[PDB]
RNA sequence: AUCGAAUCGCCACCUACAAGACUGGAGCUUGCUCCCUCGAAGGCGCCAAGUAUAUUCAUGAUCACAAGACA
RNA sequence: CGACGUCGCUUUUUGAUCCUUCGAUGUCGGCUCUUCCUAACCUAGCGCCGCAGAAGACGCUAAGGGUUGGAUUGUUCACCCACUGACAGGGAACGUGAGCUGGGUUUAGACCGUCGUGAGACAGGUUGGUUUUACCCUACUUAGCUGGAAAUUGCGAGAAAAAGAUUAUCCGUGCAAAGCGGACGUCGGGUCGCUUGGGCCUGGCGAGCGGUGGGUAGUACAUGGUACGCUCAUCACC
RNA sequence: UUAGGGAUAUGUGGCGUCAAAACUUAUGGGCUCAUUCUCGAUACGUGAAAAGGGUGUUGGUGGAUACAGUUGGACCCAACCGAAUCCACCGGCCCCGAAAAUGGAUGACGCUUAAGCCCAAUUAGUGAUUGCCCAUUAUUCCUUUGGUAAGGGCGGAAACAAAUGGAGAAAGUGUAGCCCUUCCGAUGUAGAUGUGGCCUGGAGGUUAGGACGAAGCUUAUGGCGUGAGCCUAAGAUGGACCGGCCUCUAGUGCAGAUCUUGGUUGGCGUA
RNA sequence: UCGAACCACCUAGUAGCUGGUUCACAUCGAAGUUUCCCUCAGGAUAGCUGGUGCUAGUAGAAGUAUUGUGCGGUAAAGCAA
RNA sequence: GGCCAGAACCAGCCCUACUGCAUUAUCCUGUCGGGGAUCAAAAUCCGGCGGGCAACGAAGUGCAAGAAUCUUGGGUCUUGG
């Protein structure tokens, strides 16, 4: 992942500026697990740069119980022979959202290859993410338009740390940590935008009449 | 909606003959998707009543009878559906509607949804408007209240077709995939 | 149709690490140097090292 | 330094959080009434640093990867 | 527990069938070794009893672990002796013969009984009777070398990093606060263009933080070999 | 149900991703929650399940009671209190019944405001009766080929040199098909037949080539033919024969018969 | 080399059985059924198919209807026939 | 120029935008009475009687032939010029 030293070279060499690829950042906290997938899977084969935060509030319909049970029954499945080579059951909620992607992705061609590298997950909200700028959601694979309330539900964190997961704990309290550095941060900075809100205000009064006149018929004034 | 039932209206007869110089007339009331299911239905339920064919009969009208200005009613509909364990079963139940048609076109996907009987096997024996005070069940009785009033909850509201998007921003409305 | 990895088989044996637990400590001697009696003991009074001959 | 490339929206106002059986605020009458910033916009950017008194654009000749691109 | 009836499951029995194999898929049992199944013998829990206790019956969840030594028989099977917490039932080409063994079954020698005029026959008895080849590919067991994120290429730029003249223009402290504490100077030259006491290279003096080498004293540490004070020479930041 | 292609529509089956289509359609209605073979989405496929049972939920049918039924007080029995109850039976979905041996299968992921089940729609109480996606199918267009093919033209109309409109026009089975127009069929084992269909050695004829290079041999040498194949180009290949056409003729076309002979070859620098 | 040695020849012995069987395109295109056979892994023989055609191109046409006119004893029904 | 590309028109096709006839009565209205439910109404609902066009963007009901010329639709790198 180190830049090599020519990479470096050549990058000194043009000039060029820091460059930055168009990345989409979705917050996976209550979306449905395998709706939030295939959108991004079909996002992915269009040719869309993905990093995806906070999978381990991914929720599943039903019980903890049963799904926990169903990624057991997953677990069971080993090549006997040699358990090496067999499948590989990872534990991590990000790489339980990646292998959900991966299924429903053609997996063994160059192609499938590239979308799926294209994409990125996390559990919380890492640091070279917190500041890239705006995150998204998926309106149709969210929790609070797809669930009936009545359902019980599972969270993903919740179910991968009874069945090997080991980093909840620490996932818990860097989310914890992050939230009360942003809730701070927003703290301050809300006399700039009290400030801007009020320079807006202002404007209407200094700027040309008929300028106005065509804010209100907009509806921006 | 509109219903995916027709109120028809098919008046037939046997074709006359030197037996039955002049035969009798029959009207029949059938809820059918087009006027070639009414007539087929005309004439199964003249061959088992009155064993008259298709081939030797004909057909005076086939016309559909108009729906009424919908107004909020209840309607009590008389049906009955075949079932191998069980026969013909016979019931008579009640639901809000604004049509006759509406409301025969409701007791279909109940009894689909509720008995697993399809169209077919199913004969509407009468369907009619009825006061509010003939009502007998709770769950349709209580649209009956002056001041039936509730709020819209769990509701999933999706923007219009042209507005629709896959990702937006978390707490706003800018589409940064549309 | 495969040969399972729970057979035997001819191999490397010995120079695996290990970790053995529940050693108890008998004895911390000092250098030799600073005290020459490492194996004298209160009940056996002979000034010996730790050292066998 | 080969190297000519494909990419074509910037931000130090989005880039904090949580809830959709309900988070603008009250009252009691508990679904209505009242108050408010009136509950359906993240800010900019799209050719005069700003809505005016303006100002060089060609012959790259009628489409062609924008013949340029540090906003 | 369950007659008279009745509804199923299982393929650890035989049968029925003849689809595959007759230019051949080595055919019994045992030994050895691994793994799987649960209809649970022991072991972990838990109901229920015509469960007082003790010893037991029945049932539930559970296959993680364990489930023997011998006499006779080629035997599977069976039976007996003995130990035991228990000596549960099965599958894996009726697991396993280029792994073994060859007692049995199934050639050619020979004996007996019965059968046949006879040559000969008998899921009747008997005795004797060659068990071949891996150096290939996978699998497994270990043992070496070595590329590679566009999984060999694109120059195709994504940090579980920092937080700002757009990361440039110092370093600490603080909450992405309010503030607070520090920073080697000076005299010249040369070269290029945000004009701001401009960027860069470089020279002469004087400091400071240091590295190395020599001299010199106390002290620490396992006590030959490093560190610390003071003092000289030199190099670096410069 | 099948000549070589294009476009436009469909059939079966589908429209959450894999995977074209509802970028998870509707301004349609109901039902269902199923914990270790993990509910369900299995036409054919019986390609996996029954009798029996459920106070899980959702529907029906027929009766009975009501100032009830249930509590609480008292005195099994009657009185308080202030609602609707109760009994019998029959469906739908779900659940129990439901135990096998490598780890595994609605195809996988997953799905539960379904992406499950039943029914019903095509942008929706608005004003009309084709949502969308996939064929060697349908319609249509171009081309080929063959017909039990259908027709027309074929007595050169006239005129016209080069320097500076053209070319062809055959009475025809079959060819580079005499030319043009038109219609229909076109797959196929065993098998039959046809081919101015291809190719090889030799003979009778005819017409050519070759020391300025024949045969043979070589190819990222192209061109032509649906094809068998033909032809040209190059050889920094070869050194003396040989091509086309009509007819005749035969020991006449190879991928494999544990085929014959010769050579080679991985195993292998191995045992 | 022996439950009939070896050599050459008859001998390319015979085989309803096994294996093989060399270019292209085009028009058509099956049968596994009947009868007889020491017949049952084979044949003859009809059928299916190709080729050649002949005859005055709707003539003696039809795996289909309608009408008229015949034939029947299976599904049902019956045991009070 | 026998190459590449864009616009024009021409003919043929292939998609569309523009709609009339018939029908509607178990319907539409007004009124009287009943019946209902309210604090009181109204409405749903049933009769008698009187009027009728739910009215052409009324109805998702039967059939539609409306010259892409008037009034310059789109496509043809799916055709040939
Ligand atoms: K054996
Ligand atoms: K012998
Ligand atoms: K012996
Ligand atoms: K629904
Ligand atoms: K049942
Ligand atoms: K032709
Ligand atoms: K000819
Ligand atoms: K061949
Ligand atoms: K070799
Ligand atoms: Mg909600
Ligand atoms: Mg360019
Ligand atoms: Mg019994
Ligand atoms: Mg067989
Ligand atoms: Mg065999
Ligand atoms: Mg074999
Ligand atoms: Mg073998
Ligand atoms: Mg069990
Ligand atoms: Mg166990
Ligand atoms: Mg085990
Ligand atoms: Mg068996
Ligand atoms: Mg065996
Ligand atoms: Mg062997
Ligand atoms: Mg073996
Ligand atoms: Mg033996
Ligand atoms: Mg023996
Ligand atoms: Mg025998
Ligand atoms: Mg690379
Ligand atoms: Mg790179
Ligand atoms: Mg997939
Ligand atoms: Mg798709
Ligand atoms: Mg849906
Ligand atoms: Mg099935
Ligand atoms: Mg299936
Ligand atoms: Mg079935
Ligand atoms: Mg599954
Ligand atoms: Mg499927
Ligand atoms: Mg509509
Ligand atoms: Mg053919
Ligand atoms: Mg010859
Ligand atoms: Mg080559
Ligand atoms: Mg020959
Ligand atoms: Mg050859
Ligand atoms: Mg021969
Ligand atoms: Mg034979
Ligand atoms: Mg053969
Ligand atoms: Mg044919
Ligand atoms: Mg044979
Ligand atoms: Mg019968
Ligand atoms: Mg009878
Ligand atoms: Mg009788
Ligand atoms: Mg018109
Ligand atoms: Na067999
Ligand atoms: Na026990
Ligand atoms: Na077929
Ligand atoms: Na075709
Ligand atoms: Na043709």
């Not at chain 1, 060499?13 to 820091?18: L, N, T």
């Not at chain 2, 016979?90 to 399809?118: C, P």
């Not at chain 3, 140097?33 to 090292?49: G, H, I, R, S, W």
Request: charged letters at 30%; hydrophobic letters at 35%.
């Amino acid at each position: 992942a180190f830049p090599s030293r020519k990479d470096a070279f050549r990058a000194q060499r043009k000039g060029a500026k820091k460059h930055r690829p168009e990345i989409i950042v979705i917050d996976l906290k209550d979306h449905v697990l395998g709706r939030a997938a295939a959108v991004v899977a079909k996002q992915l084969l269009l040719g869309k740069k993905i990093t995806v935060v906070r999978c381990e509030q991914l929720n599943i319909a039903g019980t903890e119980i049963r799904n926990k049970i169903k990624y057991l029954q997953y677990l069971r499945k080993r090549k006997l022979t040699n358990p090496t080579k067999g499948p590989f059951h990872h534990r991590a909620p990000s790489d339980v959202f990646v292998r959900t992607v991966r299924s429903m992705l053609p997996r063994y061609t160059k192609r499938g290859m590239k979308a799926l590298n294209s994409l990125v997950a996390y559990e919380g909200i890492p640091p070279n993410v917190v500041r890239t700028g705006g995150r998204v959601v998926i309106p149709r694979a969210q929790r609070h338009v797809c669930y009936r309330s009545e359902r019980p539900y599972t969270v993903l964190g919740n179910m991968c740390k009874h069945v090997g997961w080991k980093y909840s704990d620490v996932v818990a309290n860097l989310e914890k940590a992050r939230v009360e550095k942003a809730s701070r941060h927003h703290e301050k900075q809300a006399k700039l935008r009290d400030a801007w809100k009020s320079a807006r205000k202002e404007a209407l009064a200094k700027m040309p009449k008929h300028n106005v006149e065509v804010l209100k018929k907009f509806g921006y004034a | 909606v509109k219903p995916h039932l027709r109120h028809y209206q098919v008046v037939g007869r046997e074709s006359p003959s030197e037996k039955n110089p002049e035969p009798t007339v029959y009207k029949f009331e059938v809820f059918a998707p087009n006027f070639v299911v009414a007539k087929s239905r005309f004439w199964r339920m003249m061959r088992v009543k009155n064993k008259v064919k298709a081939t030797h009969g004909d057909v005076l009208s086939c016309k559909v009878v108009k729906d009424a200005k919908l107004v909020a009613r209840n309607y009590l509909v008389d049906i009955a559906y075949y079932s191998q364990r069980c026969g013909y079963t016979r019931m008579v139940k009640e639901f809000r509607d604004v049509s006759k048609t509406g409301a025969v076109s409701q007791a279909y996907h109940d009894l689909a949804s509720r008995h697993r009987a399809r169209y077919h096997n199913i004969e509407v024996l009468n369907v009619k408007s009825i006061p509010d005070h003939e009502v007998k069940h709770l769950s349709i009785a209580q649209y009956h209240a002056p001041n039936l009033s509730f709020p819209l909850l769990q509701r999933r509201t999706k923007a219009t077709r042209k507005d629709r998007a896959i990702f937006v921003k978390k707490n706003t409305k800018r589409a940064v995939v549309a | 149709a495969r040969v399972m990895y729970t057979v035997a088989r001819a191999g490397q044996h010995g120079y695996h690490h290990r970790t053995q637990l529940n050693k108890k400590i008998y004895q911390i001697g000092r250098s030799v140097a600073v005290e020459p009696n490492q194996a004298t003991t209160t009940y056996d009074l002979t000034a010996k090292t730790i050292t066998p001959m």
